[PDB]
Swiss-Prot record, chain A:
Its main location: cytoplasm. One of its GO terms (cellular component) is ribosome. This is Small ribosomal subunit protein uS14. It is linked to Diamond-Blackfan anemia 13: A form of Diamond-Blackfan anemia, a congenital non-regenerative hypoplastic anemia that usually presents early in infancy. Diamond-Blackfan anemia is characterized by a moderate to severe macrocytic anemia, erythroblastopenia, and an increased risk of malignancy. 30 to 40% of Diamond-Blackfan anemia patients present with short stature and congenital anomalies, the most frequent being craniofacial (Pierre-Robin syndrome and cleft palate), thumb and urogenital anomalies. It is found in: Cytoplasm, Cytosol; Cytoplasm; Rough endoplasmic reticulum. The keyword Hydrolase does not apply. The modification Phosphoserine is found at S8. The lineage of its organism: Eukaryota, Metazoa, Chordata, Craniata, Vertebrata. The modification Omega-N-methylarginine is found at R11. The modification N6-acetyllysine is found at K47. Belongs to the universal ribosomal protein uS14 family. One of its GO terms (biological process) is cytoplasmic translation.
Swiss-Prot record, chain B:
Belongs to the universal ribosomal protein uS3 family. This is Small ribosomal subunit protein uS3. The gene is RPS3. Disulfide bonds: none annotated. The chain holds residues 1 to 171 of 243 of the full protein. One of its GO terms (cellular component) is ribosome. There is a cross-link at K90 (Glycyl lysine isopeptide (Lys-Gly) (interchain with G-Cter in ubiquitin)).
Swiss-Prot record, chain D:
Polyubiquitinated by ZNF598 via 'Lys-63'-linked ubiquitin chains when a ribosome has stalled, initiating the ribosome quality control (RQC) pathway to degrade the potentially detrimental aberrant nascent polypeptide. Deubiquitinated by OTUD3 and USP21, antagonizing ZNF598 activity. Ufmylated by UFL1. This is Small ribosomal subunit protein uS10. The keyword Zinc-finger does not apply. The modification Phosphoserine is found at S78. Component of the small ribosomal subunit. The ribosome is a large ribonucleoprotein complex responsible for the synthesis of proteins in the cell. The gene is RPS20. Transmembrane segments: none annotated. NCBIfam families: uS10_euk_arch. Keywords: Acetylation, Cytoplasm, Isopeptide bond, Phosphoprotein, Ribonucleoprotein, Ribosomal protein, Ubl conjugation. InterPro entries: Ribosomal_uS10 (IPR001848), Ribosomal_uS10_CS (IPR018268), Ribosomal_uS10_dom (IPR027486), Ribosomal_uS10_dom_sf (IPR036838), Ribosomal_uS10_euk/arc (IPR005729).
From Swiss-Prot, chain G:
Disulfide bonds: none annotated. This is Small ribosomal subunit protein eS31. A zinc finger (C4-type) spans 37-60. Part of the 40S ribosomal subunit. Part of the small subunit (SSU) processome, composed of more than 70 proteins and the RNA chaperone small nucleolar RNA (snoRNA) U3. Component of the 40S subunit of the ribosome. Part of the small subunit (SSU) processome, first precursor of the small eukaryotic ribosomal subunit. During the assembly of the SSU processome in the nucleolus, many ribosome biogenesis factors, an RNA chaperone and ribosomal proteins associate with the nascent pre-rRNA and work in concert to generate RNA folding, modifications, rearrangements and cleavage as well as targeted degradation of pre-ribosomal RNA by the RNA exosome. It comes from Homo sapiens. The modification N6-acetyllysine is found at K20, K29. Monoubiquitinated at Lys-23 and Lys-29 by RNF25 in response to ribosome collisions (ribosome stalling): ubiquitination promotes subsequent activation of RNF14, leading to EEF1A1 ubiquitination and degradation and rescue of stalled ribosomes. Deubiquitination at Lys-29 by USP16 is required for maturation of the 40S ribosomal complex. There is a cross-link at K23, K29 (Glycyl lysine isopeptide (Lys-Gly) (interchain with G-Cter in ubiquitin)). Coiled coil: none annotated. It is found in: Cytoplasm; Nucleus, Nucleolus. The chain holds residues 85 to 151 of 156 of the full protein.
Length: 55, 171, 72, 104, 98, 55, 67
RNA sequence: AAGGGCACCACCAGGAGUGGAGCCUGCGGCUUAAUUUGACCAACACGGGAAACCUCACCCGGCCCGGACACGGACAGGAUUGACAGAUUGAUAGCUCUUUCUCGAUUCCGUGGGUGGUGGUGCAUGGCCGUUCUUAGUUGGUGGAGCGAUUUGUCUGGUUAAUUCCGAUAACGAACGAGACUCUGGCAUGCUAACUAGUUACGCGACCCCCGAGCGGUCGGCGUCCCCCAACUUCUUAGAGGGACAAGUGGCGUUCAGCCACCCGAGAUUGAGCAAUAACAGGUCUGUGAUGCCCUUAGAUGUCCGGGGCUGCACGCGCGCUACACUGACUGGCUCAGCGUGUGCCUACCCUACGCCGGCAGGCGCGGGUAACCCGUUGAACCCCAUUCGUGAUGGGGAUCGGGGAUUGCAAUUAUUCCCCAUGAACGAGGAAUUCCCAGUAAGUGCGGGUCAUAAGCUUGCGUUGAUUAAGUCCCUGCCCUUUGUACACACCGCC
């Protein structure tokens, strides 16, 4: 709560630095092509994004 | 350009914008007969045209709500003042739209109608509004712990191959 | 390609090139009397192999091979 | 000025890209400006092989999502000034353009 | 909760300069992307507008990771009596050159 | 005693709920509202600052 | 649960009365027995706290002690 | 219970294996404060789960309220907020204590009411996914049989990958599924074109030559869009088209559906994607600001910080990698790919050529690249060519362990990774059993992507070298149909 230690621990890197841009989860995150998307969320939004399972 | 981003990342970013815009508009105009949206992007400006059933309700009083929406998108995405435009257009033959019927049946079920009664009404609307076939599935539990699935189908449906993408509309 | 595929492509390329040049500038009557020997020796000296490769599936190490499954 | 420009066409649906390449060439002939044929860059294949399930249980089933980016370059040349000669976009949604100087 | 008076009045005057306001949901964001020079983290923006909504002054819509607070008419009148504004000043979304 | 050592049920079709079962039962024979149907259901600020701060 | 330590009591302020650390004599003369932290951003209204062997401004006007 | 049919997640005949050793990794058990937890064909290199912090849900301690809002108190004569010094604490948490400042209606307290939760419930649910099953099965209209539910159609049989068709036929005509469809592979010297792909021709060269080749040979040397200073798309890219259909022949077959053989042909079965009516109380509340209900909510199961933990080992199991060698290992030389990525809203993190220093891991300065422009003609491994070894647990094996050095990070111990010198453990082809598989397939062999501050024995792709065996069957194992039995219909996890 005090400012010196509330955010003292850095997260410049690692798995905690990155989160899903739809649900803030940190597991199964796709970082390719700047996606930054939780994978279940990406499977949900793939059609709107433009990804098609041609085969 | 180094200041610019790669074209592959650009198209991904565009689809991210389209997906998020569609979801936000869905959660905002859920009761207002939301149907869909499209964007035309040009170097001069980017245009957002929202397709809906009740545009006179989507519009605010003297366009107040549309002004409300056209500012909040620019504030979200850091858009130029004069290069973001917002339009509302009605949907032709909304009885053929999967989303518009889905929202309407959602409201009917919130209204507490009998599920068989509400599904038959929307199915009749679709069939008499012109469609080779239509099918609605309602799953969930009512008046008990156990869940049920209700299937209301008439006409013809297809499930396999490429034609299912541009023939059968889902919601 | 690799060493074998390059060699095979080269030898069929030679046969096809000579036979086409002969057909272009001199008679095909004498082009035939070498084309027949080429095919009756090895048809691959004039006709390319249509087989390339098969994609890998997500059920095993390769195109048709599947990973070990164990019930106990 | 003697001016020449390269318009870069990038799109995700081939039919629209071929259509824009059509009427831009057709405009080039109408303005009787010499134009090179649209050269096609190799198609970019964005592949994401994610897993179908949202959980851990299943038969290890994978979904292969694709995204084709098609790129084209059309070169316009003219011994006179060109930008004031052509101020037409003739575009549809789904395809983007960027015109650059051939010198730079 | 605990907000400096300059912070509340600056945030509020922003919500009246423009009828809407967005805010990325991050309590640890050191500076809001708007009104950066006022040097107030996004948390104060969060708590102030969620307290306006509880009172019945703003409508909250939430997409993926951003808030979409929409000022109401009761919010308009409540801001005027709080900031001592005459009955002529309006947001852009309420009125523009008409 | 209805499960194994980990806790997986030895009888999946022995319905452990006293109200509902393996099958869904339509209360009152699908009668009334808020329930499944029946056969009968089938038939400007910047200018204000400019004048405030000038004096 | 079963925390062995006891519930730590939070700091309670004394709810102090009026400041009254400066007086007047001979029918009114401004006189202060307190220091002032002379930092420009600290200001000339703020008074440094008095301590047994140091001086501390109310803001972060450093702390000067007697070495 | 009987009869038909199908299937390399069945067999045959084979291939490579696993089970035998070491090691990586995942379960069960043991221990612990914790070793967080789900899942037991369809769980066990799965939760894209390669965890030092975070992740983190577990354990030990310590901050904060980020308890909105309404009401009642306290209040500018003070509601209250932080705070240098000393103790105190791991802490530079004013967390607490002495200490006075400072802050100034924003808060504090009490009553309600929120809210949040990787907390419980997947046997309350949506969605998603898996499986039966990707097998071939499913349903109307009209008509016939019936008092009726219902039934025929949907079948003795031939055929196919397939109720796929042909055939007998109280049925005729349809619809879903299969097919068809989309993408992908091979062929078009046919069209369209390209300095971000190039190819032939030519001009300079550089070298080889000169016995004499001279319209001689090599050049990823330089130029011919340096724009007037060559043509063209064969090679590359990718659009529009074409092309194959059992089409030609012969034979078998009811001579029908089809099957087989052969000529010509690039191709005579390319792989995938999608995928019915329904069922599995199948898996997921730990993907979600998806969610009902319950629990917790200020000594917090909210949330932050620090440390430990997810690795811990008397043992059992699964997926794997490295080997057991001479078809080899080492030393050197020669030497050909294709997928595809590459500088970030948050987000501080890119691929890297050259030159120099170092033996190496690496270090330093200039570059290039948001990309058919640079890395990169991606000079990959295997393989090929020569030398050594010599049947020896040996120059196989590189497990275990000692010492030292670099990169990344706030942090490397329980060793992150990498480099060097050491030691050299079992293992000499693996029991009963058991997995996967039919053509660029198996198999060897590397390289990309995802994971990533650091990184693959995993996974997903790509390419290279490249076969043996078979064109069959129900024997085993499963699955489907028909018949049959039923006192089952919550439907055998049943009734009794
Ligand atoms: Mg098909
Ligand atoms: Mg050693």
């Amino acid at each position: 709560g005090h400012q010196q230690l509330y955010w003292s621990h850095p997260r410049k890197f690692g798995q905690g630095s990155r989160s899903c841009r739809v649900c803030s989860n940190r597991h199964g995150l796709i970082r390719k092509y700047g996606l930054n998307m939780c994978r279940q969320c990406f499977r949900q939004y793939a059609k709107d994004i433009g990804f098609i399972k041609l085969d | 350009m180094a200041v610019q981003i790669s074209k592959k990342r650009k198209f991904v970013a565009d689809g991210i914008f389209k997906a998020e815009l569609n979801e936000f508009l869905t959660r905002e105009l859920a009761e207002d007969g939301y149907s869909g949206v499209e964007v035309r992007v040009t170097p001069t400006r980017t245009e957002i045209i929202i397709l809906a059933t009740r545009t006179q309700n989507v519009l605010g009083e003297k366009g107040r709500r549309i002004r409300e929406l056209t500012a909040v998108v620019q504030k979200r995405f850091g858009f130029p003042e004069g290069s973001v435009e917002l339009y509302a257009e009605k949907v032709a033959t909304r009885g053929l739209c999967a989303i518009a019927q889905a929202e309407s049946l959602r409201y009917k079920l919130l209204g507490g109608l009998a599920v068989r009664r509400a599904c038959y009404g929307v199915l009749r609307f679709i069939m008499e509004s012109g469609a080779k076939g239509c099918e609605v599935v309602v799953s969930g539990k009512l008046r008990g712990q156990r869940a049920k699935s209700m299937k209301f189908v008439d006409g013809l449906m297809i499930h396999s191959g490429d034609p299912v993408n541009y023939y059968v509309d889902t919601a | 390609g690799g060493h074998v595929a390059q060699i095979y492509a080269i030898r069929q390329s030679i046969s096809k090139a000579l036979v086409a040049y002969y057909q272009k500038y001199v008679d095909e009557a004498s082009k035939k009397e070498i084309k027949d020997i080429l095919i009756q020796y090895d048809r691959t000296l004039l006709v390319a192999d249509p087989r390339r490769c098969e994609s890998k599936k997500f059920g095993g190490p390769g195109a048709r091979a599947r990973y070990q499954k164990s019930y106990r | 000025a003697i001016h020449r420009i390269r318009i870069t066409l990038t799109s995700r649906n081939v039919k629209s890209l071929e259509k824009v390449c059509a009427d831009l060439i057709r405009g080039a002939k109408e303005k009787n400006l010499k134009v090179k044929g649209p050269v096609r860059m190799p198609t970019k294949t964005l592949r994401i092989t994610t897993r179908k399930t949202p959980c851990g249980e299943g038969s290890k089933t994978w979904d292969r999502f694709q995204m084709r980016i098609h790129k084209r370059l059309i070169d316009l040349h003219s011994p006179s000034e060109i930008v004031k000669q052509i101020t037409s976009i003739s575009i549809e949604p789904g395809v983007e353009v960027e015109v650059t100087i051939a010198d730079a | 909760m605990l907000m400096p008076k300059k912070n509340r009045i600056a945030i509020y005057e922003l919500l009246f300069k423009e009828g809407v306001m967005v805010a990325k949901k991050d309590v640890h964001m050191p500076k809001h992307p708007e009104l950066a020079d006022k040097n107030v983290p996004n948390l104060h923006v969060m708590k102030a507008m969620q307290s306006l909504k509880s009172r019945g002054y703003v409508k909250e819509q939430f997409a993926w990771r951003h808030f979409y607070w929409y000022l109401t008419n009761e919010g308009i009148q409540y801001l005027r009596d709080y900031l001592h504004l005459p009955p002529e000043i309006v947001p852009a979304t309420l009125r523009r050159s008409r | 005693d209805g499960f194994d050592s980990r806790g997986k049920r030895e009888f999946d079709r022995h319905s452990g709920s006293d109200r509902s079962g393996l099958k869904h039962e339509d209360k009152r024979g699908g009668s009334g509202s808020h329930n499944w149907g029946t056969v009968k259901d089938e038939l400007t600020l910047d200018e204000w600052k400019a004048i405030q701060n000038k004096d | 649960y079963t925390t062995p330590k006891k519930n730590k009591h939070k700091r309670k302020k004394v709810k102090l009365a009026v400041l009254k650390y400066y007086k007047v004599d001979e029918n009114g003369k401004i006189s202060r027995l307190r220091r002032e932290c002379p930092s420009d951003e600290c200001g000339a209204g703020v008074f440094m706290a008095s301590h047994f062997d140091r001086h501390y401004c109310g803001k972060c006007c450093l702390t000067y002690c007697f070495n």
